[PDB]
Amino acid sequence: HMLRLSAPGQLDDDLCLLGDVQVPVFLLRLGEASWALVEGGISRDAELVWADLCRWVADPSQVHYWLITHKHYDHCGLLPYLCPRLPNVQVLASERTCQAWKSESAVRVVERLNRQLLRAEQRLPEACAWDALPVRAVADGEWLELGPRHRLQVIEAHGHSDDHVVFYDVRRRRLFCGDALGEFDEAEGVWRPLVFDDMEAYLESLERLQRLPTLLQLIPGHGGLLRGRLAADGAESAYTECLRLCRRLLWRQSMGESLDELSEELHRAWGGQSVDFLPGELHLGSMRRMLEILSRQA
Ligand SMILES: O=C(O)c1ccccc1-c1cccnc1
Ligand SMILES: [Fe+3]
Ligand SMILES: [Fe+3]
């Protein structure tokens, strides 16, 4: 489809997709000798993303920033493995996201999930300690002056998770939105909600994002770049899909169903898209957690 760019390589004059479209790392060209990365992928893609990076970046000491939307294992798994190969990089993440990397228990969960995704006999490169990452915490509303023609605003966007932020390039009307709008359904063209921490926060983040100057390019955590009407309408559509799921939950409960019934149906209808980077137990359990959240707050 012409409104979804979903191939590795160049996406715009300044922007490339590295790795797999399902868990991509974006590469911004900031100048002749300066680059940034956006989103932090899954650990097992280290050599793939590194190889792709080196096709565009002849000297990786020119990689100066790495912007991170949130602490989930599929959005920061590359950091310890590519860190050592990027001697000038500064990781830019929220305060709560940075805090997660200082927690032994939180780090354990991330490492276990990423290691479930290794192909057999696959060995990972030498890793920085999670608590030694070259991180700089960024605040809600902060302007990241990345280069002469790259200025991105941090916007708090809690709900999917309690640390989540998005990054807005107003010059290009371009929003890196992480998972805050949900998972874009490639077959049907609609947003699937991903409410895994707080429904009220998730919806209020979408209300605020809807107020941004009209979007031209919308870049979520999975699936590529959305443009045209999909970008312009994305936040509003994500919000109305979340409400649709609430009504659906209420309708079935009112017929005496357990949360497990709609959970299995959502896993069946939606779990196939992420099967290659998400353990299926996690998808089904995530569907259950989401319905538990919607059921409590509705
Ligand atoms: O956030 C996602 O990308 C996602 C999408 C569908 C199902 C589960 C997750 C998820 C849940 C928890 C931590 N990581 C990922
Ligand atoms: Fe997530
Ligand atoms: Fe994700």
C-beta neighbour count of 232 within 10 angstroms: 16
Ligand 1 site residues (CB inside 6 A) read 72-74, 179, 183, 194, 196, 221, 274, 278, 282-283, 286
Mutation test residue for ligand 1: of 97, 194, 276, the one with most atoms within 8 Å of CB: 194
Mutation test residue for ligand 1: of 282, 287, 288, the one with most atoms within 8 Å of CB: 282
Residue 118 CA neighbour count, 13 Å, CB half? 14
**How far, in Å, is the centroid of ligand 3 from the Cα of 200?**
20
Mutation test residue for ligand 1: of 117, 196, 275, the one with most atoms within 8 Å of CB: 196
Expressed as residue numbers, the domain containing 101 is: 1-298
Q: Is 160 annotated in some ligand binding site? A: yes
Q: How far, in Å, are 116, 118, 121, 193 from residue 110 at the CA level?
A: 10, 13, 20, 22
Distance from C-alpha of 289 to C-alpha of 127, rounded to nearest angstrom: 32
Task: Among the bound ligands, name the one nearest to the CA of residue 196.
Answer: 1
Q: Is 1 annotated in some ligand binding site? A: no
**How far, in Å, is the centroid of ligand 2 from the Cα of 221?**
8
**How far, in Å, is the centroid of ligand 3 from the Cα of 222?**
7
C-beta neighbour count of 196 within 10 angstroms: 20
Cβ burial of 103 (10 Å; 0-12, 13-18, 19+) is middle
| Angle between helical axes of 259-270 and 234-253 (0-180°, round to 10) | 140
* Structure solved via: X-ray
Domain count along the chain: 1
Atom 15 of ligand 1: nearest residue by CA position: 72
**Bridge partners of 151?**
145
Asked if residues 155 and 170 have their Cβ atoms less than 8 Å apart, the reply is no
Q: Is 74 annotated in some ligand binding site? A: yes
Report how far Cα 26 is from the mean position of its chain's Cα atoms.
11
CA dihedral over 82, 87, 93, 99, signed as positive or negative: positive
Could you tell me which of 245, 144, 251 has the C-alpha nearest to residue 199? 245
Q: Is 158 annotated in some ligand binding site? A: no
Tokens 């929220």 found at: 94
Distance from C-alpha of 219 to C-alpha of 199, rounded to nearest angstrom: 22
AA letter at 82: L
Task: Round to the nearest angstrom and report the end-to-end CA distance of the chain.
Answer: 36
Atom 11 of ligand 1: nearest residue by CA position: 286
Residue 69 CA neighbour count, 13 Å, CB half? 31
Atom 3 of ligand 1: nearest residue by CA position: 179
Distance from C-alpha of 94 to C-alpha of 96, rounded to nearest angstrom: 6
Which CATH number goes with the domain that contains 124? 3.60.15.10
Report how far Cα 7 is from the mean position of its chain's Cα atoms.
17
Asked if residues 219 and 230 have their Cβ atoms less than 8 Å apart, the reply is no
